[PDB]
């Protein structure tokens, strides 16, 4: 029994990025850009008035 | 029994980034950029008034 | 029985970044950038008024 | 002079079972089943009345 | 002069079972089943009345 | 002069079971099952009445 | 700022002369001539009257 | 700021002369001539009257 | 700030001459000539009257 | 100056006999017969009356 | 100056006999017969009357 | 100056006989027969009357 109550945010999965995986007899390889990401900022605010009012209840029950 | 009550933030998983994994007889390889990320900042605020009011209850029960 | 009540922050997992894993007879390899990240700052604030008011209860019960 | 008087039972010969003999650059190979046999039972009897009356004379002669 | 008077039972010969003999650059090889056999039971009887009356004369002669 | 008067039972011969004989650059090899056999029981009887009456004369002669 | 005031003479660049780079299974390779040059003589004069009167002002300025 | 006021003479650059870089299984390799040059003579004069009158002012300035 | 006022003469750079870099299983390699140069003579004069009158002012200035 | 006055007998030259010279990924090779010759007998006589009468003069002159 | 006055007999030269010279990933090789010769008998006579009468003069002169 | 006055008999030269000279990843090699010769008998006579009458003069002169 798999129960997921709440999931959010950056969660990519099962991603494969490859270049010349089984390359044979290749010549010069230059300026290969395989960068996945640059910056990870969950809260990025400029001159912001951040006032969230949330009453949240997380209740997930597995009865057997 | 797998129960996930709350999950958030940066959590990528099962990611493979490779270059010339089984390369044979390759010539000069230059300027390969495989950087995954640069900066990890959960809270990044500039001139911000950060006033969040949250009443949150995390209650997940597994009854057997 | 796996129960996760609350998970957050930077937690990537199962990530493989490799270059020329089983390379044979390769020539000059120069300027390979495999940096994972630069800076880890959970709270990064500039001229910020940080006033969060949170009443949070973390209650997860496993009854057997 | 090759003389065979009596031959019986399980005697297979000159059998070759192979998979990917000279395989190269294969990413995944999973759940390969090359089992030759499971159980060798010459007499397997359930609720059996086994009463065979046999008189046998194995007489093979090589005269030179 | 080769003379075989009586041969029986389990006697397989000249059998070759192979997988990836000269394999190169294989990323994953999982759950390979090359089991030859499980159980060797010449007499396996359940609730059996085994009463065989046999008179056998194994007489093979090589005269030179 | 090769003379075999009586041969029986479990006697396999000249069998080769192999996996990745000359393997190179393999990342993972898991759960490889090359078991030849499990149990060797010549007489395996359950609730059996074993009463075989046999008179055997094994007489093989090489005359030179 | 790249400024070149005067450049002359023999200055070839970025030249690649190659033969059988990744050659395989070659029976014979004979009399391969890859000579780049023979003689470097800036002044080579025979029975010459060399009388050049030159006034040169090499003035190149980078103002920031 | 790169400033070159005067450059002359023999100055080749970035030259690659190669033969059978990754050669395999070659039976014979004979009389391979990869000579780059033979003689370096800046002034080579035979029965020469060398009388050059030159006034040169090499003045290159980088002002910051 | 890189400033070169005067450069001359024999100054080649970044030159790579190679033969059979990663060679394998070669039966014969004979009479390989990789000579770079033979003779370095800046002034080589035969029956020469060398009378050059030159006034040179090498003045290159870096002002910060 | 090459002078051959008398040449006779078995003298073959420059003969190449090969099988699978640069073979790759070949299966079983069996019963390869590359025998050059069996028997070398210059004089082989059976019940022979061998009576040769020869007056032979071998005179070859190289005058320089 | 090469002068050959008399040459005879078994003198083969420059003969190459090879099997799988640069073989890679070959399977079982069996019963390879590369025998050059069996028997060397210059005089082989059976019930022979060998009576050769020869007056032979070997005179080769190199005058310089 | 090379002068050969008389040459005879068994004199083969420059003969190469090889099997799997640079073999890689080969399986079982069995019953390889590379025998050069068996028996060397210059005079082999059976019931022979050997009566050769030869007056031979070997005179080769090199005059300089």
- Report the alpha-carbon distance of residue I50 to residue I24 in Å, rounded: 55
Q: H24: buried, middle or exposed (CB in 10 Å: 19+, 13-18, 0-12)?
A: buried
Taking the CB of residue F28, how many other CB atoms lie within 10 A of it? 10
- Report the alpha-carbon distance of residue C22 to residue C24 in Å, rounded: 7
Under DSSP, the state recorded for B10 is S
CB D52 within 8 A of CB E54: yes
- Rounded to the nearest 5 percent, the helix, strand and coil shares of chain G are 0, 55, 45
For C33, residues 6+ apart whose C-beta sits below 8 A from its C-beta are B32, B33, B34, B35
Q: Which residue in the set H12, H17, H39 is minimally distant from G10, CB to CB?
A: H12
Closest CA to J48 of C5, H19, K44: K44
**Cross-strand pairs, G42:** none
Closest CA to G56 of G6, G15, G2: G6
Alpha helices (runs of H) in chain F, residue ranges in sequence order: none
Rounded to 5 degrees, what are φ and ψ at H52? -95, 125
Which position has the token pair 């990320």? B37
Give the nearest chain C residue to A20 (CA atoms).
C20
> How far lies B40's CA from each of A12, A41, C14, L34, in Å?
17, 6, 18, 71
- Report the alpha-carbon distance of residue L42 to residue L10 in Å, rounded: 9
Over its C-alpha atoms, chain I yields an Rg (Å, rounded) of 22
Rounded to 5 degrees, what are φ and ψ at C12? -75, 155
Q: In angstroms, how far is the first alpha carbon of chain F from the final one?
A: 10
Q: Which residue in the set A13, A26, A46 is minimally distant from B14, CB to CB?
A: A13
Q: Which residue in the set F3, F20, F36 is minimally distant from E36, CB to CB?
A: F36
- Report the alpha-carbon distance of residue K23 to residue H43 in Å, rounded: 57
Give the nearest chain I residue to H36 (CA atoms).
I36
Give the nearest chain L residue to K32 (CA atoms).
L32
Give the nearest chain H residue to G44 (CA atoms).
H44
Which position has the token pair 């790759």? J24
Q: Which pairing describes strands L29-30 and J49-50: parallel, antiparallel, or unpaired?
A: unpaired
Rounded to 5 degrees, what are φ and ψ at B3? -125, 125
**Cross-strand pairs, J2:** K2
- Report the alpha-carbon distance of residue D4 to residue F4 in Å, rounded: 10
User: How close does chain E come to D8, measured CA to CA in Å?
Assistant: 5
Q: F14: buried, middle or exposed (CB in 10 Å: 19+, 13-18, 0-12)?
A: exposed
Give the method used: cryo-EM
User: How close does chain F come to E43, measured CA to CA in Å?
Assistant: 5
Taking the CB of residue B43, how many other CB atoms lie within 10 A of it? 19
Contact A56 B54 (CB under 8 A): yes
* H vs I: CB pairs below 8 A: 226
For I63, residues 6+ apart whose C-beta sits below 8 A from its C-beta are H61, H62, H63, H64
- Report the alpha-carbon distance of residue E63 to residue F64 in Å, rounded: 6
Closest CA to I23 of H18, C29, A26: H18
- Report the alpha-carbon distance of residue K34 to residue L17 in Å, rounded: 7
Contacts of C10 in chain A (CB under 8 A): 40
Give the nearest chain A residue to B58 (CA atoms).
A58
- Token pair for residue F6? 């009586």
Contact H12 G11 (CB under 8 A): yes
Q: Which residue in the set D2, D9, D39 is minimally distant from E2, CB to CB?
A: D2
User: How close does chain J come to K9, measured CA to CA in Å?
Assistant: 5
- CA angle, corner L42, sides to L40 and L44, nearest 5? 95
Give the nearest chain L residue to K15 (CA atoms).
L15
Q: A25: buried, middle or exposed (CB in 10 Å: 19+, 13-18, 0-12)?
A: middle
Q: In L21-30, which positions are buried (b, 16+ CB within 10 angstroms) versus exposed (e)?
A: bbbbbbbebe
Contacts of C8 in chain B (CB under 8 A): 6-9
Instruction: Identify the residue among A12, A25, A34 best suited for mutation to test binding to C, counting C beta carbons within 10 A and taking the highest.
Output: A34
Q: Which residue in the set K23, K59, K61 is minimally distant from L20, CB to CB?
A: K23
CB C54 within 8 A of CB B54: yes
Residues on chain A bordering chain C, Cβ-to-Cβ distance under 8 angstroms: 9, 40
- Report the alpha-carbon distance of residue F13 to residue C59 in Å, rounded: 66
CB C12 within 8 A of CB A9: no
Contacts of H39 in chain G (CB under 8 A): 38-41
Contact A11 B7 (CB under 8 A): yes
Contacts of J46 in chain K (CB under 8 A): 46-48
């Amino acid at each position: 029994n798999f129960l997921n109550c709440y999931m959010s945010g950056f969660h990519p999965s099962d991603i494969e990025v490859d270049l010349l995986k089984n390359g044979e007899r290749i010549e010069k390889v230059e300026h290969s850009d395989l960068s996945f990401s640059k910056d990870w900022s969950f809260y990025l605010l400029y001159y912001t008035e951040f006032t969230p009012t949330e009453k949240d209840e997380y209740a997930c029950r597995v009865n057997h």
